[PDB]
Amino acid sequence: GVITCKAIMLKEAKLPGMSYADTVQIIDIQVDPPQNVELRVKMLCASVCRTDILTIEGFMAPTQFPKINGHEGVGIIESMGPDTKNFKVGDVIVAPTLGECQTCSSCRSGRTNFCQNYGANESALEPDGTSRFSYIDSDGKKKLLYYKLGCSTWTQYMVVDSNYATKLNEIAPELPPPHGSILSCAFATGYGAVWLDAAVQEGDSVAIFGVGSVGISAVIAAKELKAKQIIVVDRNEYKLKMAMELGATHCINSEKLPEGVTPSQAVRKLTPKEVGVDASIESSGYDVFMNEAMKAAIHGKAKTVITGEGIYENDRIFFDFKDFLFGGNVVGNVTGRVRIHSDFPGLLRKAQEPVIRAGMDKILGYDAATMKCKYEVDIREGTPALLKALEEVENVDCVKLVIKLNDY
Amino acid sequence: AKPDKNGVITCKAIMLKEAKLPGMSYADTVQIIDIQVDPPQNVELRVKMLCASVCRTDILTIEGFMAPTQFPKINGHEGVGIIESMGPDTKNFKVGDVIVAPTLGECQTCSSCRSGRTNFCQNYGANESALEPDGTSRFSYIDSDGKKKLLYYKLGCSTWTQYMVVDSNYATKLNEIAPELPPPHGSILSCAFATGYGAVWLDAAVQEGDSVAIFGVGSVGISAVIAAKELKAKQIIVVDRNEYKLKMAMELGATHCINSEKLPEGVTPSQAVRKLTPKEVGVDASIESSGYDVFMNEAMKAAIHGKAKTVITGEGIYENDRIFFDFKDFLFGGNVVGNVTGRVRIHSDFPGLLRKAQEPVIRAGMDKILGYDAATMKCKYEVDIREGTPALLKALEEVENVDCVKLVIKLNDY
Ligand SMILES: NC(=O)c1ccc[n+]([C@@H]2O[C@H](COP(=O)([O-])OP(=O)(O)OC[C@H]3O[C@@H](n4cnc5c(N)ncnc54)[C@H](O)[C@@H]3O)[C@@H](O)[C@H]2O)c1
Ligand SMILES: NC(=O)c1ccc[n+]([C@@H]2O[C@H](COP(=O)([O-])OP(=O)(O)OC[C@H]3O[C@@H](n4cnc5c(N)ncnc54)[C@H](O)[C@@H]3O)[C@@H](O)[C@H]2O)c1
Ligand SMILES: [Mg+2]
Ligand SMILES: [Mg+2]
Ligand SMILES: [Zn+2]
Ligand SMILES: [Zn+2]
Ligand SMILES: [Zn+2]
Ligand SMILES: [Zn+2]
């Protein structure tokens, strides 16, 4: 029942000064059959979240190497543990970081996805300390591989606890793989941050700090929800122009501001009476933008939704104290607050509307005739092609790199 | 006091000459002096103050908090008084009304007011200039050289004065709902009590059966305990290093107490709080009322991820004017808000709070915070502006006494 397949292994953290070649390799791994309520999933593609690059740099993994990378991806159920309910072999699933038990006081509040019973699997292991992944090293020893959290997506086959899975095939049978892959993290996060957490209403103003794939998904949501004003802030003019094309109304290049004008000052100057924005979204990973987004919000009334991640000194972020006391309102957000049972089905339906699909196509640079994305690499084409693709994640026009894992 | 023929009142006020920086004394910067108080203009109230009461933010103001250029000033934002006169444009107030005038007004028409969920009014926000909008001040003094000099406010007014002037858009009346309320209770309703009570009642929206953590049980945190008890919280966990105020908190409804200076080896305040909750899930509502930057982060971490709100009331003079949060715990369900005056809106919420303050258990708790003696109308720690600068300097040092919860500054006969 053991599958042998290709996976992207991280040997150790890539610390500053080290290369991708030093730590990243495509290898053959062994994937054990699923136990209990687990799904073993034939992956179609992964797509590269900035958090995947932070993971390569050791984020949230002080001991959890070697590992198979990745949390953003989509695939098809190949087999299931004997206790599984509510899934079938052949279902198309995504498996984000947080499940939804629907019975804990967090689920029952109706206002959060931080489920007390199906929270983030920070151990990067099965609950017994084992892993469904292993490999045979050059010494010929069988060695354990850690997951990312509850699973790894940079692999032709993964195993995940079905309490974290949600299916695509009943609502969206024709959804292309790359779209399913960004729905598993990037698109849910940006869209949800605006729709659910900031709770943007028709006529609200929105500021979005960082228009990578997450920020652009937030623009798409703000436009869909008929925000009066959608302000985008970034150093990347290509991605600012893409945000404007998908509905942003005002753009600010933060690296072209005068030295004495902060990003929050620049945002506030666009709003009437310098009052700030109804909803402030941070989607950059830049600790400075977390404090700027907090400042750009209308004091008291508006919520600042922090989605960014990064490797911060002492794992700490900072806020300017006076501006925080006098009306700051900041929340941490994982996966857009999009609960896998209560919210994700509705987001999946929305994603199929033509303007939403067009925006996802633009994020991906998707060609529906060829099913190819602008920036794509196939796990079957070897380690050198992958290392080059990982470097090209920093290209100005690379919004979302796709890793193809199997035939579609 | 009686105005001169030009309407100017001469009275006592507590002047701050400059910031009391580290190593400086209260004697270096704090003096009771005679000041002139101009007549009110426009929609202003000129108010005969009954008493001020000492908020930790008053002491921060003495240390220069939020006042890089706004010295010399008259201190104080917590206090109560009686309208003596009004500007010609004033609406909805009478001479003789008893008022308090906190930092935020409530226009009722801006998008923040109409949200129903904040007190941060866009039209009547904090007056950080510590001046009138034209750059004048209603306060001046004659210095030792014989020259008339300007005095800054705290924000929109100063309370440490026998007579204050404030824009009536920041005032709310006590005498219709609570005519018998004593002055020091009115004073703590203007800041300390509203802040702790409102942080629990309005901002954290504590429900019957919720668990609550309160970091710092000074007057603000003890007011939070009183609210959490009134709202029938299941669990009220208080954290501090002052054993006297932890014990007062327990007497007024706290269920568990933690001494942050006596924790086991390897245990943070947030861990200590979570250890008292089922499966170490933390609390439904986390209140910070200490001014200790460490406790703002511990309060964030004690809250149930995602579900709970952490309400930050604390103030201080911090390294690089910033505070910090542990990033992984913050991203994975942190929820932190800045709170001024408990989110208690002066028109929409204050009347209800003033009615609650008259209920017997709530009044008993206010009496305990103040150490109030109804027979003498005197508080346990009280100093009178009419009795000289030396007595004031001693009282300011005695703010640090373990059993000083709320120092009252009497300003006028009651
Ligand atoms: N909370 C979650 O569930 C969640 C989900 C998705 C991604 N993330 C995090 O959210 C962030 C956004 O994800 P992404 O994949 O879109 O990342 P990304 O790297 O693709 O895009 C980030 C954008 O922010 C901009 N930015 C970063 N630093 C900047 C600076 N110094 N000046 C100006 N602009 C700056 C970049 O130019 C870029 O356009 C990342 O930090 C990622 O790790 C978190
Ligand atoms: N946001 C507002 O509207 C508002 C209103 C009132 C007060 N404040 C601020 O809120 C805080 C509470 O005000 P207060 O007048 O009750 O203050 P206070 O100083 O009388 O009481 C603070 C309490 O916190 C405890 N604390 C402080 N540092 C500590 C440490 N290192 N370890 C353990 N415990 C510690 C103290 O021992 C004390 O019991 C202050 O910072 C004050 O400046 C703000
Ligand atoms: Mg398992
Ligand atoms: Mg005025
Ligand atoms: Zn991600
Ligand atoms: Zn749950
Ligand atoms: Zn105060
Ligand atoms: Zn208003």
Numbering used by the authors:
A (entry chain A): 15 to 422
B (entry chain B): 9 to 422
Q: Which sentences from the paper describe this structure?
A:
Hydroxynitrile lyase from Linum usitatissimum (LuHNL) is an enzyme involved in the catabolism of cyanogenic glycosides to release hydrogen cyanide upon tissue damage. Herein, we determined the ligand-free 3D structure of LuHNL and its complex with acetone cyanohydrin and (R)-2-butanone cyanohydrin using X-ray crystallography.
Because of the low sequence identity of LuHNL with structures of known proteins, the initial structure model of ligand-free LuHNL (LuHNL_lig_free) was built using the BALBES program. The crystal belongs to the monoclinic space group P21 with unit-cell parameters a = 94.12 Å, b = 52.18, c = 168.51; α = 90.00, β = 95.01, γ = 90.00. The electron density of NAD+ was observed in the crystal without the addition of exogenous NAD+ during enzyme crystallization or soaking of the crystal in an NAD+ solution before X-ray diffraction. The NAD+ molecule was bound to the β11α6β12 fold, a classic binding domain for ADP, which is consistent with the fingerprint for ADP binding that identified from the amino acid sequence of LuHNL. Beyond the water molecule that bonded to the second Zn2+ ion, a glycerol molecule was trapped via hydrogen bond interaction with the water molecule and residues of Thr111, Lys162, Glu323, and Thr349, which implies that the second Zn2+ area is the catalytic site of LuHNL.
